[PDB]
Amino acid sequence: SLALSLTADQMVSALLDAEPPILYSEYDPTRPFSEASMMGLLTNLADRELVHMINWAKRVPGFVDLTLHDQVHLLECAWLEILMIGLVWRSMEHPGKLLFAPNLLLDRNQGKCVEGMVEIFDMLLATSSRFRMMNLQGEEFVCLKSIILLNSGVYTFKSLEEKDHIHRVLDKITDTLIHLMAKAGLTLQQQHQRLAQLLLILSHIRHMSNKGMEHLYSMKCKNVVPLSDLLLEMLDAHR
């Protein structure tokens, strides 16, 4: 019951300290892209990011209390959602660009380098513009990313007290988002409206993950890119 006892400020504190590092791409900026090379860069980056995502998840309050099986299920369900909200967040201050890494900032026209990809880039860019429009804050971001982890696979779960604990932890994160808003001086009405605005983003994030997973899968099949064993496994979980 360690995670239920955290205060709002301690929740934010723990989420901030659990943040993964921003990784660089193995991309050299004197070489043009091809469909193969770009898919290679994006997935290579993602594969390295997944390892750090596991350490982050284990630091999300309440997550280490869940069984290994349940932990696995939640990460398998949410992994690309989690990569995408990170992407969208770090692209927030780069209108019209997706900052995959600090040395790999891609425009929408560069999404056209991979078949069926610019449509996904456009969705990611629109979500990023929404973040910018809302003036989304860093403390709110880490809250939202933690909610995705805990929520996306939560109904695919006899130990029913696992589901209940996880729902308590979700409630704490809601309380934490509200705390942040009250602290910034929003009126009650504004807190409630903003909480809803932030949570509706997660429907859009889920959509982009499902499309992204269809695309990655299409890329795997026609062999445009060889994927790591981890990625093939993370991908196999969705079909």
């Binding site: 390892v51 596991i54 350490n55 284990k58 290994l68 696995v72 398998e76 981890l230 993370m234």
Partner: peptide
């Protein structure tokens, strides 16, 4: 022998 399983047990 899922990689994820092993990463989770070996997490830092």
């Amino acid at each position: 022998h899922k990689i994820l399983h092993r990463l989770l047990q070996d997490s830092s």
